[PDB]
Each structure stands twice: as C-alpha cells, then as structure tokens.
Amino acid sequence: HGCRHVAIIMDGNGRWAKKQGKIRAFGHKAGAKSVRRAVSFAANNGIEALTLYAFSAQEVSALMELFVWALDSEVKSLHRHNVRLRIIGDTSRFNSRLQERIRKSEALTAGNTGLTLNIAANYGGRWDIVQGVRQLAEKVQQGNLQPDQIDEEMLNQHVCMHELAPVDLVIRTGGEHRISNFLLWQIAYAELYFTDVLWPDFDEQDFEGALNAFANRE
Amino acid sequence: GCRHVAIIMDGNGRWAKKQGKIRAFGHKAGAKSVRRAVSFAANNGIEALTLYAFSSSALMELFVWALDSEVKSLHRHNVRLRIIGDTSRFNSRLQERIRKSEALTAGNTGLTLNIAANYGGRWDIVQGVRQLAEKVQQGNLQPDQIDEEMLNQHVCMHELAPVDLVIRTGGEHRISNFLLWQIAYAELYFTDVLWPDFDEQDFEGALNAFANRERRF
Ligand SMILES: O=P(O)(O)C(O)(COc1cccc(-c2cccc(-c3ccccc3)c2)c1)P(=O)(O)O
Ligand SMILES: O=P(O)(O)C(O)(COc1cccc(-c2cccc(-c3ccccc3)c2)c1)P(=O)(O)O
Ligand SMILES: O=P(O)(O)C(O)(COc1cccc(-c2cccc(-c3ccccc3)c2)c1)P(=O)(O)O
16 A cells, blocks of 8 residues: 555544434543554554544643543553554643653553554644754754754654654544644645544544555555 | 635646647646636635645746736736745846845735745745744744744744635645645645636635535534
8 A cells, every 4th residue: 555654633523422312421432442443454454653643721631631541551452462652742741650651651562563653642733843943942052053054854853753654644534624733744745635434433444445545646 | 714725736737638738738728727816816805825836947937937927917906926935046037036026016905925936845844943043043042932933933924814725736635845834724625626727616616615614613
C-alpha cells in the first residue's frame, strides 16, 4: 500500500450511542473497542506508525486524568503486542505522577519492532508548532542560532513525530470534513480521507477501504 | 456565512489532454476559470478569495503581463489585490509591478483577492518564525512569551477573516503545502471537476455544502 504513517481523528461515538438509544458511556466502550481493532489492523498490516486523536474547562483537565489512569491498564497489553507507545500533546500541565506514568510507558515499549502508536492528549497542531518554535526561541536567546538560519527543514525537527515516517494518510470518521487543529505541520503532503462511518463502526474493512483508496490515489 | 474561501486550482494539464490538446491550451481555459471564480466570489459577498495554482523567466514575464493587463479591471471592480508567498527572488521589475499593483488597489473595499505566488505553507510559518526570532534577538521577546496568537499575527493574511473553506479541484485530496496554520478550522471540499470546468455551479454547491455542514456541525 505504500503507506507508512496513518493518523486518525476518531469521531461519532456519542452519535453512535444516541442512534442505538444508549448513553455516552456505552459509546466510549464501543469506541475503545474500535481503537483496539484499528491498532491490530495496523500491526497485522506492516503499518509503521499509527497516530490517534479523539475529537470532542476544568472537567477537561479531569477527563485527561481518567485517560492517563486508563492508559495504565492497556500499556501492558501493548508491550505484549510488540507496540512502541508515544504520547503527544501538552503533557507539561499534567501533574508529575501521570508524566512518569508516561515515560515509564514510552520507556517500556520504546524498543519494539512492531507498530509505533501515538495517542494525542491535550494536543493542538498550532500549539505543536508553537512549542517547536519555543525551542528555537531558546537557541536564539542563548546566542547560538541566527534568525535567518531557521528554515522549514530545521523547524520540522522540532515538531511532534519528527523521528517518524511522515504522515501519508489522515482518516477522519464521523462525517465532518475539517482538520480541527489536529496535525497541521505534519500533514502538508498527507492524503486526506473523510468518511461518514461513526468511530465505533469503523473496522478492518473500513481501514482497508482507506488504504486501498490511498494506494490507488498514489 | 462563508467569508473567506481558499481554492487549489488543479487539473489544467489533465484537462487539455482530455481535449487531446497541448498544455498551453489548458492554461488559457484555467485563466478564464479564474476570472469567472473571482466574478462569482465578488458578486456574492465573499470577503476574501485566495487562489493557489497547483503544478507538478518565461513565467515571470507572463506574470508582469497578467498584472499589467488585468489590474485596471480588478481596480474598477473594486478588488483589493495581494500576492502571498516568497517574491524575494523575483527580478525587481516583477517585484516592483507586484508592489504597485497592491499599492494601487490597497484601499479598495470590495473583495480581497490573494494570489499565491511561490507560496508554501511551511514557508509561511517559517518566515513568521524568523520575524519572531529577530525580536528575541533584539531582546524584546522571551521564548515563553510566544503563544498561538503571537505566531498568528505573523502568518500570511493575519489581517483578514479566517479561511472558512478550502476547495480543491482536480481530484487529489491533499493540501500539498498550501495554507497550513490558516486552515486548522476550515471546511475542506474536494471535487474531481477539473479547474477549467469548475464553474459558478460547482462553486455554489461548495458554498451550499459549507452551509449545510456548518449547520450539522
Ligand atoms: O495479533 P493477535 O491476532 O495475537 C491480536 O489480534 C492482537 O491484539 C492486539 C493487537 C494490537 C494492540 C492490542 C491492544 C490491546 C490492548 C490495548 C490496546 C490499546 C490500543 C490503543 C490505545 C490503548 C490501548 C491495544 C491488541 P489478539 O486478539 O490479542 O490475539
Ligand atoms: O463524541 P464524544 O463527545 O462522546 C467523545 O469525543 C468520544 O471520543 C472518544 C473516542 C474514542 C474513545 C474515547 C474514550 C475512550 C475511553 C474513555 C473515554 C472517556 C472516559 C471518561 C470520560 C470521557 C471519555 C473516552 C472517547 P468524548 O471524548 O468521550 O467526549
Ligand atoms: O461581466 P460580468 O457581469 O461577469 C462582471 O464584469 C464581473 O465583474 C467582475 C468582478 C470581479 C472581478 C472581475 C474580473 C474581471 C477581469 C479579470 C479578473 C481577474 C481575476 C483574477 C485574476 C486576474 C484578473 C476579474 C470581474 P459585473 O461585476 O457583473 O459587471
């Protein structure tokens, strides 16, 4: 398929549950179930990297804590499937507990030869670029880099997922046709694939539809 | 209410071939397709229209000629012209015609027509970064005082309404290093129609599409 890195904006969980006459909890359950199925397909299909983003003030900060807490149960199962785990996003405003709980994770799986999975939490694409810019701002304040020296190639080394294959394909489920400030810098050349299917119903045959669409769109 | 539309014009060559004609025959049709798109945007209350030609010294001269021969009309139609992109390596005459074309129509209140010229989305961001890095050297700025809004004031078209809709003709589904920072929230519309055939009807439907989706989401 000539597809190395896949990014998915997951969406439709709430909508999926409403149609079934169910409450959000039931949808998240079906969503998470869909997250496992998607990873699996990535591993079993030589995909190199898979980046996921769950699309939706105080609660938010809490919701991210439930996320880190749950992101503790599944880590073990991930190592066992030979998956390297990366967590992009603004994890700097997160307490020191969850952060170790993160590097522990990335540390542990760090050496797998399986798929590289990255999960966005408190991620922004403008912010992503910003914080890459802040790193260059520091080098300039130190006195080692001249403004006119900064080029695309340089800044690209400072944004999320620089060590990885560039994103070849972005898939958005749930019907909306917006990037909604997920990856910006990283998708300058990516194939954009939008589908009406709601996330919980997104499956292998749907992930195949997109890789075939990408492969054929060459 | 779609205020700012961005278009990636593509499929001029493919279009020619289909007629079994040469690459130049399609450029001619593309240019008519550009005029019609601009009449439409302006006749329909759009604030800004951003055009990006997609390709895969002769050119710099057709540039001067297009500007020389087409700017009086844009001005009569009250269109405000802007060229976005790196115009630094263009011979000074082109650079001077561009500056004057802009300066001529700077004050118009009609539609603002932004023409991408040797523009790249990452470049746009990088140049903004360079401006900020000068103010960090000048010691007027501290690294942790940079935020999305600050970066936002130095990316192309920061002074205009945010881009609401990006239309790409020609069938490919990529942004291809066109606007990047600017489309974090834009509607993205893909159509297989080829740029020279893309018309007032194709346009109306993209806009309608935007409306219905703006209503659903
Ligand atoms: O390759 P198989 O046929 O042995 C199998 O499909 C592999 O199952 C997995 C493959 C890839 C990833 C997982 C997995 C398990 C548990 C949690 C997660 C996980 C994925 C994404 C975010 C958090 C957690 C993934 C399981 P199985 O069902 O575990 O036997
Ligand atoms: O469409 P929404 O507003 O129901 C939502 O975007 C759905 O997004 C998800 C997609 C896939 C997986 C999840 C998810 C997995 C596991 C736990 C949770 C979760 C747990 C507790 C509270 C909120 C979310 C979410 C969420 P949200 O993040 O749950 O609000
Ligand atoms: O002949 P009509 O009825 O289509 C009409 O002239 C259209 O008016 C226009 C509005 C805005 C811009 C134009 C226009 C005219 C000629 C050239 C260009 C032009 C567009 C893009 C690049 C270079 C030139 C735009 C015309 P009018 O506004 O309805 O009088």
